[PDB]
Amino acid sequence: NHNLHITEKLEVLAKAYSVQGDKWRALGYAKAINALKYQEACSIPGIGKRMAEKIIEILESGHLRKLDHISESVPVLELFSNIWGAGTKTAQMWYQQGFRSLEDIRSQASLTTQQAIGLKHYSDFLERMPREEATEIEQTVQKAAQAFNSGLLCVACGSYRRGKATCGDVDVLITHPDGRSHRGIFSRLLDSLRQEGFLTDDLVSQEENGQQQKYLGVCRLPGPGRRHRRLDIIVVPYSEFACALLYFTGSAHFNRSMRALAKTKGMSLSEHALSTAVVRNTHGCKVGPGRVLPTPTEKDVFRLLGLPYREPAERDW
DNA sequence: GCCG
DNA sequence: CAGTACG
DNA sequence: CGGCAGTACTG
Ligand SMILES: [Mg+2]
Ligand code: NA
């Protein structure tokens, strides 16, 4: 990156729009900020005239005036928004109600079960773990899984799979290549991890149902010097394994770019599958289902979209 | 915010 | 349902 | 003008 004086100033702006709920403008900035990672400004995709102008103001002037006049509410909104389970609406509401610190939130705010947990682990959830710790967390989930049923497939996705040194959490994808081998596997896996005292909190866990798709919660390895880590587990049918793998590996931007591409071909891509001949209206909204395509591997999904394959490492963007 |  | 979250 | 990804929970 040859433009950090510029990007870091836009970045602040990106986050400010994001936390204030102007999500499409934030999206716009995020693209431009990755491009950078006047005539020449426009030349790059993701960078329009209005973005170009802001770069020239930084290049020429050295300050950025929209930066100067960012609402002073924004740092507090970002403080609040980093509570897991709280987003831009809740953060604004709290602000409106006069709250300005986590101490206020603690003593005065009404909190959902999820938000109380997020607050309890506020610092921990802002940290990233060394990818080696992610390895141990995966192995812990895997061995519990495989004990119940061997041959089961367990794999760490997200930033871990993309080869990052550090991970914000652990994403464990579980599947069985032997058809429909899992009935109430969540019941047993989670009970298993609870008995070990490995899980510390649950954020999202609809266990009253049966067809629980995901578990999102909190875990902590045994011994001194350990922090609470976020853990997401999903169990999928084997036929959906490549698409689940692709989804859960990300990046989020990579996924959305790829999904947006499929939409351009009358196709559709989700955690579940890649479909063809999807019927959508003038607003881009699905009005008729297409038809699931065979995708035994990730390479198939790429191939069926007419794309060259990309290793997980090359999917940060 | 960008872009078709 | 709105809000938040997952990648 | 208007889409910007497509999903899964909570309450
Ligand atoms: Mg939050
Ligand atoms: Na992750």
Paired with A218 in beta bridges are A201, A230
Distance A209 CA to ligand 1 centre (A): 26
The neighbouring-strand residues paired with A154 are A174
Judging by beta carbons within 10 Å of its beta carbon (0-12, 13-18, 19+), is residue A87 exposed, middle or buried? middle
Question: What are the structure tokens assigned to A157, written together?
Answer: 């996705």
Using alpha carbons, select from A137, A132, A135, A146 the residue that is nearest to residue A175: A146
With CA of A158 and C1' of each nucleotide, the nearest comes out as C7
The reply to whether A85 and A116 lie within a common domain is yes
The contacts of residue A45 (CB under 8 Å, 6+ apart) are A35
* Ligand closest in space to the Cα of A77: 1
User: How many whole angstroms from its chain centre is CA A152?
Assistant: 25
CA–chain centroid gap for A275, Å, is: 23
Q: Closest by alpha carbon to A169, among A224, A218, A118, A117?
A: A218
- Domain extent, residue A186, equals 128-250
> Are both A136 and A231 inside the same structural domain?
yes
Active-site annotation holds for A54: yes
Q: Which two tokens stand for residue A137?
A: 């967390």
Cis peptide before A159 (omega within 30 of 0): no
Q: Is the CB of A225 under 7 A from strand D?
A: no
**Unique residue bearing structure tokens 């102008």:** A53
Q: Are strands A170-175 and A229-235 parallel, antiparallel or unpaired?
A: parallel
Positions at the binding site of A for Mn(2+) = 169, 171, 232
End-to-end CA distance of chain A: 15
Question: Which of A221, A250, A279 finishes a domain?
Answer: A250
Q: Which of A250, A269, A300 is the last residue of a domain?
A: A250
**In the PDB record, what is the listed experimental method?**
X-ray
Same domain, A288 and A175: no
Longest dimension (CA), chain A: 64
Instruction: Please report the DSSP string for chain A in residue order.
Output: ---HHHHHHHHHHHHHHHHTT-HHHHHHHHHHHHHH--HHHHHSTT--HHHHHHHHHHHHTSS-HHHHT--TTHHHHHHHHTSTT--HHHHHHHHHTT--SHHHHHHH----HHHHHHHHTHHHHH--EEHHHHHHHHHHHHHHHHHHSTT-EEEE-HHHHTT-SEESSEEEEEE-SSSS--SSHHHHHHHHHHHTT-EEEEEE---SSS---EEEEEE--SSTT---EEEEEEE--GGGHHHHHHHHH--HHHHHHHHHHHHHTT-EE-SS-EEES-EE-TTS-EEE--EEPP-SSHHHHHHHHT-----GGGG--
Specify the nucleotide whose C1' lies closest to residue A280 (CA).
D3
Distance from C-alpha of A261 to C-alpha of A226, rounded to nearest angstrom: 42
Cα A278 from Cα A287, distance rounded (Å): 8
A249 touches strand D (CB under 7 A): no
Residue A195 sits in a domain of what CATH number? 3.30.460.10
* Same-domain status, A97 and A172: no
Residue that finishes a domain, picked among A95, A127, A159: A127
Q: Which ligand lies nearest the alpha carbon of A230?
A: 2
Token pair 């919660």 in the structure block, residue: A217
User: Hunting for tokens 């005239």 — which residue is that?
Assistant: A49
- Same domain? For A132 and A230 the reply is yes
Give whole-number Cα distances, A56 to A42, A50, A77, in Å: 11, 10, 29
Are A111 and A5 part of one and the same domain? no
Q: How far is CA A179 from CA A31, A148, A233, A237, A238, in A?
A: 41, 17, 19, 7, 6
Residue with minimal CA–C1' distance to C4 is: A85
Tell which residue, A75, A125, A117, has the closest CA to residue A100: A75
Looking up residue A295, the CATH number of its domain turns out to be 3.30.210.10
**Bridge partners for A155 per DSSP:** A173
Same domain, A206 and A156: yes
Q: Compute the C-alpha angle A291/A293/A296, nearest 5°.
A: 155
What is the rounded CA–CA span in Å between residue A41 and residue A47?
Answer: 7
Provide the domain count of chain A.
4
Question: CA A78 to CA A213: how far, in whole Å?
Answer: 30
Q: Rounded to the nearest 5°, which phi and psi values hold at A154? A: -125, 135
Closest residue (Cα, C1') to D5 = A256
Say how far A213 CA is from D7 C1', in Å. 11
Q: Identify whether residues A235 and A140 lie together within a single domain.
A: yes
Closest CA to A162 of A288, A246, A282: A246
Active-site residue, selected from the candidate residues A9, A31, A54, A214: A54
A240 and A267 part of one domain? no
Smallest Cα–C1' distance to nucleotide B4: which residue has it? Answer: A264
List the structure tokens of A248.
């859960």
* Shared domain check, A263 and A189: no
| CATH for A32 | 1.10.150.110
Residues A189 and A238 in one domain: yes
Q: Which of residues 15-34 of A touch strand B (CB under 7 A)?
A: 24-25, 27-29, 31-32
The number of beta carbons lying within 10 Å of the beta carbon of residue A203 is 19
Ligand nearest to the CA of A86: 1
Sign of CA dihedral A111, A114, A120, A125: negative
Residue indicated by tokens 């997020």: A118
Q: Between the CA atoms of A273, A275, A279 and A282, what dihedral angle is there, to the nearest 10 degrees?
A: 70
The reply to whether A240 and A138 lie within a common domain is: yes
Q: Which of residues 85-114 of A touch strand D (CB under 7 A)?
A: 112-114
A260 CB neighbours strand D below 7 A: yes
Query: CB within 8 A of A177, min separation 6: which ones?
Result: A151, A153, A238
- Going by C-alpha positions, the residue among A124, A234, A123 that lies closest to residue A172 is A234
**Proximity of residue A213 CB to strand D below 7 A:** yes
Q: Which residue type does A284 have? A: G
> Using alpha carbons only, what angle is made at residue A312 by residues A310 and A317, rounded to the nearest 5 degrees?
75
